[PDB]
């Protein structure tokens, strides 16, 4: 049948620690069975940003054996304090949604 989402995984998955002006780039991978389509939806702390500018616009997929991976990336070029918080990536197939989270910290010092 081939409609299962196996998991949704963030990279880095934990311990992200940034300074003001530094880049945040988060990878989200949905591993699935062969027949699945995926739509990604991100939640982030800052109300500074449109989803459209943070989330990749290109198609990022991979097929191998009887599995597929779908990649979504969130990029903030130059973080501020309001970017500290929980980032959630949800992957939806229409049948089901699976999600994963990580906490990003922003320290108040200029980036090296």
């Amino acid at each position, epitope marked *: 049948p081939g409609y299962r989402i196996y998991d949704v995984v963030l990279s880095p998955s934990h311990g992200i620690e940034l300074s*003001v*002006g530094e*880049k945040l*780039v988060l*990878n989200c991978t949905a591993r699935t069975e062969l027949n699945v389509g995926i739509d990604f939806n991100w939640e982030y702390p*800052s109300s*500074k*940003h449109q989803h*459209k*500018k*943070l989330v990749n*616009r*290109d198609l990022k997929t991979q097929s191998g054996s009887e599995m597929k991976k779908f990649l979504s*990336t969130l*990029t*903030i*070029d*130059g*973080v*501020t*304090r*309001s*970017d500290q918080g929980l980032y959630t990536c949800a992957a939806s197939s229409g049948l089901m949604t699976k999600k994963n989270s990580t906490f990003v910290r922003v320290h*108040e*010092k*200029p*980036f090296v």
Partner: antibody, heavy 117, light 112 residues
């Protein structure tokens, strides 16, 4: 609407200092980093530095470390750039611009500085 | 400390033809799987205006006549076809590393 409003044209003697202002409105001031950019006679862009108003973290281009001083007044939503020990090489349009975490999204109208005796 | 070499300094194009502007960086402007290269347009008396962010993303409101590509150290802005409203100066800018740096600019004029 977001606007950045810059102070008017300045005519300053060599050796003196000038303090140029950028007034922000239409948004939460403390949340966005403000950058300054120099342009001589309508061609070429040079980044000077940025200021983060929430905690006043500042980063400079090394080329401008001795020349520019960035400050902010949260109560009036204004970022200032001071330029010291002026010479004709400092005559330029100076822009302020807001960065949103992706790009410069709003710009001031520019402030013309003319250093002259 | 990244130097951007933009060419040509000046370009005379006929209405309806293609313009190609190049930017070479002294070192990679890529990190984390992104290219931190941006393209601006500037007309006289006005501030610069963003066309393309991160090498290939078209800013909202910019026509698809404008197209960016490349990676690492070599980047291209294509304009195809050239409308008369394209008469302006064009800048590349990198945000991979501080200090932020711009190319010298390409001035686009019309053939007659």
């Amino acid at each position: 609407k977001v606007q950045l409003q810059q102070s008017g044209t300045e005519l300053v003697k060599p050796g003196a200092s000038v303090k140029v202002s950028c007034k922000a409105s239409g948004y939460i001031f403390t949340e966005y980093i403000i950058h300054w950019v120099k342009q001589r006679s309508g061609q070429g862009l040079e980044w000077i530095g940025w200021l983060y108003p929430e905690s006043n973290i500042i980063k400079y281009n090394e080329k401008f470390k001795d020349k520019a001083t960035l400050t902010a007044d949260k109560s009036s939503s204004t970022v200032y750039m001071e330029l010291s020990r002026l010479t004709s090489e400092d005559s330029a349009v100076y822009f302020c611009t807001r960065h949103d975490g992706t790009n410069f999204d709003y710009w001031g109208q520019g402030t013309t500085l003319t250093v002259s005796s | 400390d990244i130097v951007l070499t933009q060419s040509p300094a000046s370009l005379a194009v006929s209405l309806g033809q293609r313009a190609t502007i190049s930017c070479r960086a002294s070192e990679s402007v890529d990190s984390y799987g992104n290219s931190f290269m941006h393209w601006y347009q500037q007309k006289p008396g006005q501030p610069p205006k963003l066309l393309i962010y991160r090498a290939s993303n078209l800013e909202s409101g910019i026509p698809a006549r404008f197209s960016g590509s490349g990676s690492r150290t070599d980047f291209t802005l294509t304009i195809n076809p050239v409308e008369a409203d394209d008469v302006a100066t064009y800048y590349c800018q990198q945000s991979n590393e501080d200090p932020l740096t711009f190319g010298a600019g390409t001035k686009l004029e019309l053939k007659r």
